[PDB]
Amino acid sequence: HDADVLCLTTDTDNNYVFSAGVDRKIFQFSQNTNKSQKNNRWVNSSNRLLHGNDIRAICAYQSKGADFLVSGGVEKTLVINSLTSFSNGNYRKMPTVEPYSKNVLVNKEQRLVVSWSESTVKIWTMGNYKLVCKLTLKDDQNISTCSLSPDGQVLVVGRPSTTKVFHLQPVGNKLKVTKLDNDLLLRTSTKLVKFIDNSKIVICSCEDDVFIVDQEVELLEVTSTKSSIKVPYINRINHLEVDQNIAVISRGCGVVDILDL
Amino acid sequence: INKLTPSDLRLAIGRSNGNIEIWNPRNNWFQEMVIEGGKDRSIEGLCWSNVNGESLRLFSIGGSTVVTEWDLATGLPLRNYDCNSGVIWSISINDSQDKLSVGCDNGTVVLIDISGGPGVLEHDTILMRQEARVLTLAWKKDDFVIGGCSDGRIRIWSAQKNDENM
């Protein structure tokens, strides 16, 4: 390399060693030839510049249906090359964000759109556009899912620790926010908030409890498989969608349930 | 290599603002879950432990003196073990994955005993110290631990139990 070698890995049978660092290239060292093996000699086999800024992390998986090395650095994207077909074959750069969980949402009335980055919500309205408010809530430390009510009334921020509700007043070139205390909400974790009504909210918790606030749906358990006891979150409720007192949840072991409210 | 792809194969990504993604390489990498860390948190490294027939454990070291074993259900840490020396610079796992090496800022390599089931981590043994901070680590087998330091040197410790040079 031309500068520091931040991270490096090998394959299963130790015929290749891949290495990368701050000079944004990946070097592949080979010991495949039987003369190179019986002489125990490595050769600087190849070299690929596929990254943008750095590579601070690299790993490799190798099975009968997989041999790929994965890498990522200061440019935030992730890159995948093949392992035994490193210099020869194709690669694939995954995009910098695939939003399987969303961080931005729009309400059509008032033509307004909120976004939550880490522990702050920024809201702006359409016309052109004006940035109408932001909330840099500091007693919050880690962020997760939000939802804004229809009619732009109550926003709820929610994280795996607590959740907070904010009632708003449109005052022209600006919006006015006020909190309100709800202790069941502050004590229980939320995964998703999705607004059955303007006032009743169904809430999934991180300990998989469903609440119906401002009450408690029974959920029939699935027979846990060996892969389910291996990966301890596939039998957890991922999604819930609700419109007018009928909702759907989905757990990522291949199970979607409806539920009537 | 000579077996089929197991159905629990996941990839763990630790970012620098402190959020861990977990991806699945089935049909072009769907992101199963996210475990966010809050303000001023990072993750300098992480490791997997799957003792055969028990739940997956995901440990991570941030920029501080702790080892965090995460419970993957709630997206919350089930253990925040303050490692008993130094700021942690690196971490690695045993082969058979019952011990957990951390390489510190004051030059210790601290072993953390894992085989108590998920959730529990014990202090085990601070290895023979040095001066320069040990920035990276690896194991040979259960026997030795290799560590690259910040003085341009690579130390080889023998962590083999019931041997005289432990």
């Binding site: 093949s82 892969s227 | 792809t5 159905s7 072009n28």
Partner: peptide
């Protein structure tokens, strides 16, 4: 560049 074999889905 994916996990394409005869392996099962998230079951076993």
């Amino acid at each position: 560049l994916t996990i394409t074999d005869e392996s099962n889905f998230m079951n076993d």
